C-alpha cells in the first residue's frame, strides 16, 4: 500500500584494485526499502570481453578472474510491491 520505491546503495562506488588481486567485492546488501528487497540483480555494462559475464543475484557481489580493463555494474533492487531502483557501481582494474 502506497509503498515507496526501494533505494539501491552500493558501498564501493569507485572500486580500485590491481591485476594480482582480481577477486574483489561490491556490497549491495546495504540497499534500503520501506518493506524489504526481494531481489538484488547485478549486471555489467562496460565490462570488457572476458571468460564470463555477470548476472548474479546475490546481494553482496563476489568477483573473480578479472582481466585488466574498466568495469561498470548496475545493481537492480526489487520492492515487495514491484518497485525497482537501479544504481551503478564502478570498478577499475590495473595492469
Amino acid at each position: 500500500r502506497k509503498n515507496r520505491p526501494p533505494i539501491a546503495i552500493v558501498s564501493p562506488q569507485f572500486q580500485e584494485i590491481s591485476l594480482p588481486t582480481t577477486s574483489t567485492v561490491i556490497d549491495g546488501s546495504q540497499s534500503t526499502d520501506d518493506d524489504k528487497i526481494v531481489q538484488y540483480h547485478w549486471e555489467e555494462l562496460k565490462g570488457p570481453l572476458r571468460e564470463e559475464k555477470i548476472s548474479e543475484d546475490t546481494a553482496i557481489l563476489k568477483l573473480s578472474k578479472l582481466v585488466p580493463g574498466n568495469y561498470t555494474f548496475s545493481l537492480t533492487v526489487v520492492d515487495s510491491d514491484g518497485a525497482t531502483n537501479s544504481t551503478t557501481a564502478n570498478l577499475t582494474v590495473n595492469k
Binding site: S11, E16, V25, S29, T32, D33, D34, D35, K36, A59
Partner: protein, 518 residues
C-alpha cells in the same frame, strides 16, 4: 507520606563484608512524556527505509524503564579495583530497588516562555515485570543506564520492543503488548516504590587470569609413556617408507598426548589498529563473521569468547569479536579509532583460540602411495568433548546480566557480551507519567482525549545489589599483576571530573588480573 516529607533518603555507600559486598547506589532521574502517551508501531518503513538485514517491526510504548545493567551503576572505580585485585570471582546474590522522592512537574509554554510548576495531585505509575510476560530489552547493551557518577542526573529511556516481521509487515503471530494491561502502582509526590529480588544460582565470574597454558599442562622433566608417529620415511629415496615411533616428552612438547583441547572457535577478520597494515578496500561488512536467521544476516559482535590476538601483537583486534566502548564526548557515527576503547580479551588465550586464527588443521583425504597427506583448515569449530574454554570478561562499563531466551534448549548460556546469564534476571521496572487531560469539551465527544497537560516527572532511584565474592588462596610466590592508577603527573585525575565537571571513564577495566593455574 505527605507532600512535605521526603519518601526516602540518599544511600550510595558500598560496604565490604567478610564474603560479600553490598553496593548501594542512588541517582536522580527525569522521566519525560513519551510518544505523547501513545502506543505507536515502529518499523523500518517508519524510519525511512532500511535494508533486509536491518528490517524490523515493533511498538514504541509511552513507558520509561530503569536499567541498572552496567557494572559502573554500582561499583565505583576504587570498588572495582578492590573487587578485581583481591577476588577470584563474584556473583550477585540479591538486589533491593527503591524509587522515592517522586515529584511531578507541570510545564506551561502559553506565552512563549516555559514555566515549570508543581503538580502535586498528579501521579506517576511504576510496575515491575516480575513474571517476565513482556519483551526483555535489558541485556541488549543499550544506553540509559544509571550514570557511572553519582552526581549527575539521567533521563529514563523509552521502552519499545520488536516482534516478528516479514519485512516491515507484521506476520500473524507478532504480539502487541499493552503495558496498561499490567497492575501498576500509582504514586503521588508522597508515595514511593520498592521491591526486592533474589538472583539465580549463576556461577561465579572467572575474575582471574590463567597462569598456565592449556597445551603446557605437564611435567617439563618427565616424558610420557605414550608414543607418537615421528617419521614416515626413513630417507630421501623413492621407495623408502617406514613408521618410526618416538616417545613424546619434554624435548617435543607439541606432539604429546593431552586430555583437553581449547574451546570452540568462530573465526573473525583480523583488522589492525595501524591502518596502513589493513587492506585498501571496504571490508567492514563484507569481510565480517555473521550468522543468518530467517534469511537476514546479522553480525556476530562479539560471538564466542576467543582470545583477541597472539602474544606480541596488541594492534590486531577481531573485526567484531571484541566489545568496543566510547570515550567521554564521543559521537555515534564514524568516530576515529582513537575515540573508542577496544577491549582486549587476551587474558583467556591460555584456554581459548585466537579470534583471528583458525582452530587448527584437519586431515581431508586418505593418503596412499599416490595421494599426498592433504590437510585442511578449521575456520570454525563447534563444541567437542574435552573442550575447555573461558567466558568473556565483564568490564566496569559492560553489561552485568542477560535473560536466557525461553527455548527448548541452549548450550552454556553465559551472555556472549559478558555477564551472568539468567533464566529469571532482574525484572524490568517500567515507569510512566500518568496522562492528565487538559480540558475536555463541555459537550460529550466519543473520541479519545488528545489534549493532555504537558508535564514531566523527576525523583530519586536507589538500587542495592549484594555480591558474593570468591577470595583468593594461592601459593604463588611472586607478586601478581594488579590494577593500579599510574603515579605520574597528569592534567586530570583519571576516573574523576575535569574542569567542566564532566566525569570520564578513561579505559575499560576488566576483571582478569589475579592468576589461577589450570
Amino acid at each position: 507520606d505527605g507532600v512535605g516529607s521526603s519518601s526516602g533518603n540518599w544511600h550510595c555507600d558500598s560496604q565490604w563484608l567478610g564474603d560479600r559486598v553490598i553496593t548501594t547506589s542512588t541517582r536522580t532521574w527525569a522521566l519525560p512524556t513519551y510518544n505523547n502517551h501513545l502506543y505507536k508501531q515502529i518499523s523500518n518503513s517508519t524510519s525511512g527505509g532500511s535494508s533486509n538485514d536491518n528490517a524490523y517491526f515493533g511498538y514504541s510504548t509511552p513507558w520509561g524503564y530503569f536499567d541498572f545493567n552496567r557494572f559502573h551503576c554500582h561499583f565505583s572505580p576504587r570498588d572495582w579495583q578492590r573487587l578485581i585485585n583481591n577476588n577470584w570471582g563474584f556473583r550477585p546474590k540479591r538486589l533491593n530497588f527503591k524509587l522515592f522522592n517522586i515529584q511531578v512537574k507541570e510545564v506551561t509554554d502559553n506565552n512563549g516562555v516555559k514555566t515549570i510548576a508543581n503538580n502535586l495531585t498528579s501521579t506517576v505509575q511504576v510496575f515491575t515485570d516480575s513474571d517476565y510476560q513482556l519483551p526483555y530489552v535489558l541485556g541488549s547493551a543499550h544506553e540509559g543506564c544509571l550514570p557511572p557518577f553519582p552526581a549527575d542526573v539521567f533521563m529514563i529511556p523509552q521502552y519499545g520492543y520488536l516482534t516478528l516481521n516479514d519485512g516491515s509487515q507484521a506476520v500473524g503471530r507478532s504480539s502487541f503488548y499493552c503495558l496498561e494491561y499490567f497492575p501498576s502502582q500509582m504514586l503521588r509526590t508522597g508515595n514511593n516504590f520498592q521491591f526486592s529480588y533474589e538472583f539465580e544460582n549463576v556461577p561465579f565470574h572467572s575474575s582471574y587470569a590463567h597462569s598456565q597454558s592449556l597445551d603446557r599442562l605437564m611435567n617439563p622433566l618427565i616424558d610420557q609413556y605414550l608414543y607418537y608417529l615421528s617419521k614416515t620415511i626413513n630417507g630421501s629415496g623413492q621407495n623408502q617408507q617406514t613408521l618410526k615411533f618416538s616417545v613424546a616428552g619434554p624435548s617435543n612438547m607439541a606432539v604429546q598426548g593431552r586430555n583437553y583441547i581449547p574451546g570452540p572457535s568462530y573465526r573473525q577478520q583480523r583488522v589492525s589498529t595501524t591502518v596502513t597494515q589493513n587492506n585498501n578496500s571496504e571490508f567492514a561488512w563484507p569481510g565480517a563473521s555473521s550468522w543468518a536467521l530467517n534469511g537476514r544476516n546479522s553480525l556476530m559482535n562479539p560471538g564466542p569468547a576467543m582470545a583477541s590476538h597472539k602474544e606480541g601483537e596488541d594492534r590486531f583486534f577481531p573485526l567484531s569479536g571484541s566489545l568496543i566502548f566510547g570515550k567521554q564526548g564521543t559521537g555515534r557515527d564514524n568516530v576515529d579509532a582513537d575515540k573508542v576503547m577496544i577491549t582486549n580479551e587476551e587474558e583467556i588465550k591460555t584456554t581459548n583460540p585466537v579470534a583471528t586464527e583458525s582452530y587448527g588443521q584437519v586431515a581431508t583425504n586418505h593418503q596412499s602411495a599416490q595421494a599426498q597427506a592433504q590437510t585442511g583448515w578449521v575456520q570454525n569449530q563447534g563444541i567437542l568433548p574435552g573442550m575447555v574454554w573461558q567466558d568473556r570478561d565483564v568490564y566496569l562499563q559492560g553489561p552485568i546480566w542477560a535473560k536466557i531466551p525461553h527455548t527448548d534448549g541452549n548450550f552454556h548460556p553465559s551472555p556472549l557480551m559478558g555477564g551472568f546469564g539468567m533464566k529469571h534476571p532482574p525484572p524490568q521496572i517500567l515507569i510512566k507519567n500518568t496522562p492528565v487531560p487538559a480540558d475536555p469539551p463541555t459537550a460529550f465527544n466519543k473520541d479519545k482525549l488528545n489534549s493532555f497537560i504537558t508535564q514531566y516527572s523527576t525523583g530519586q532511584v536507589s538500587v542495592e545489589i549484594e555480591w558474593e565474592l570468591q577470595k583468593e588462596n594461592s601459593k604463588r610466590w611472586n607478586p601478581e599483576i594488579q590494577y593500579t592508577s599510574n603515579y605520574y603527573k597528569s592534567n586530570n585525575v583519571e576516573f574523576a571530573v575535569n574542569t567542566e565537571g564532566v566525569y570520564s571513564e578513561p579505559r575499560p577495566i576488566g576483571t582478569r588480573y589475579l592468576t589461577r593455574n589450570l
